[PDB]
Amino acid sequence: APTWFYNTTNSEKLRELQHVLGGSAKLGYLTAKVTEILDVDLETVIRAKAIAAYRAVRVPVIVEHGALCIDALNGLPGALVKPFWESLDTRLCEVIPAGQRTARARGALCYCDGRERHVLIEETEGEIAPSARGTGGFHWDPIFIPKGQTRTFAEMSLDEKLSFSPLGRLHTRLRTELGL
């Protein structure tokens, strides 16, 4: 029987997690729907999802949230990844000016056993792409290019993305802290 339960609702975030932490016998998987807080700060959102998800499942839970922060939009989308994705899918590469393209992709995990929350945050500095390129990802992976490469996240494979994406360094940190 597991000890920690990862709660997610996106079907592709689950497939990338189980590619990395799928063999661990002490990680379970739940799909409880919790009411998403909306805020620009990633530290605020991920710390409030852990209360909202512990109330739903009442087991030691792990939650996840992402953020895209563009310097042309002065920190927006931020942790508002739901209302921009429901309005600008990948047309968000058009609505920002073409002179300054730099942005930062950020991710956060928070695990809560009921007594205390612990937040892990990674971050990748990159720059937004001129047009949407690629299929293999979720939410903005066709329009984000990390610093150093010429290639987007969705143009990469799954092993290539998790060596650059923020959610790849978090899942290695989550393995060693929880002993998964």
């Binding site: 029987a1 739940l30 009442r58 009921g114 007594r115």
Partner: protein, 277 residues
Amino acid sequence: TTLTLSEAAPLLKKEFREGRLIPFLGAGFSKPLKLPDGSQLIASLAKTLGFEPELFDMHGRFEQLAEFFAISAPNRLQRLVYEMSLSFDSAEAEALREKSPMHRALAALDWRTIYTTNYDKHVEGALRDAGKQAAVLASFADFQGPRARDVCEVIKFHGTLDQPDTIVLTESSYFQRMALDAPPDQRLRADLLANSFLFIGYSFSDTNIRYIWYRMNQLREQSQLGVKHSQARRCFFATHGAGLVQPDILQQWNIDVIQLDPTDKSASVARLLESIA
């Protein structure tokens, strides 16, 4: 302070071999039957009174909104009991009850007494699907009727849909059942002296089963007030999310909390009932 599936399996088996285990089934036991909520049913009946369904739900709890039908429009309360009888006991709910592993694992055991708090017929009908006989006990006329000793007695603790005057659904009816004077309550007063209880399908925020959990403990302590204090049989409460504070409260009410696997709700209850066999 929380048992797992494998730890609670020899504890439940020891109570069952000597015939001292009684299930106490809640609304979560009828969850795989895909029944309507009842709060959705009472909201759609409020359209005739000028309420929007999301606005009528705002003005109180479900038993409080049923109190409003009991005093301001009594023909809509009888309409509510009518269309729950068409919905909770439909032919589609029977077909899901045939293939439900929770209801098959319940009926695979030779119980003597099964308690339930939900109004539908699917606790007895699980026993009829296994070729076993069941006796519904809800009113005074049900206890007076004759039956054999082999028949499992299923006591409807809050009434049955075929006896609409036994339904405990109005808020005032919940308050007057706290005195424990109903015929299902008087049967509970004698069964707590000898038996252990298996509570399946409740939440910690119910506030009605919590009074019953308190009052059972008070009646056990009152029954040994002059004699030396002897140890009673432990009761059990199967949960998918136990929390961190509530299992310690339940332990002082002679109830041990069993943590079931929360990934599949229906399968983990079925593995609990099959480990008793």
